[PDB]
């Protein structure tokens, strides 16, 4: 893919949290930071299933992977 995925993902990330922390840090707990909770992923997925048409689960995935941006940036890259 292009950098529009790594960027968009991050962009859609910092946007999700509504803060400017993940935009930099590549290991800023999206859960331990309170930035995210769960409902966020749902949305992110919506955008992750449009620009990336990802097929990530939700029922009960490895939040650990959806806890950080990197772990995600990798999940998005390992989905395309």
Curated annotation (Swiss-Prot):
GO molecular function: D-alanyl carrier activity
Alphabetized HAMAP family for the sequence: DltC
Pfam families, alphabetized: PP-binding
Swiss-Prot/TrEMBL keywords: Cell wall biogenesis/degradation, Cytoplasm, Phosphopantetheine, Phosphoprotein
Biological function: Carrier protein involved in the D-alanylation of lipoteichoic acid (LTA). The loading of thioester-linked D-alanine onto DltC is catalyzed by D-alanine--D-alanyl carrier protein ligase DltA. The DltC-carried D-alanyl group is further transferred to cell membrane phosphatidylglycerol (PG) by forming an ester bond, probably catalyzed by DltD. D-alanylation of LTA plays an important role in modulating the properties of the cell wall in Gram-positive bacteria, influencing the net charge of the cell wall.
Main location: cytoplasm
Post-translational modification as stated in the protein's UniProt record: 4'-phosphopantetheine is transferred from CoA to a specific serine of apo-DCP.
Coiled-coil ranges from the UniProt annotation: none
Superkingdom assignment: Bacteria
Signal sequence, start to end: none
GO cellular component, one term: cytoplasm
Sites of O-(pantetheine 4'-phosphoryl)serine modification: 38
Subcellular location: Cytoplasm
Involved pathway(s): Cell wall biogenesis; lipoteichoic acid biosynthesis
Family: Belongs to the DltC family.
Domain (Carrier): residue spans on this chain: 1-80
GO term, biological process aspect, one: cell wall organization
Keyword Nuclease in annotation: no
Protein name: D-alanyl carrier protein
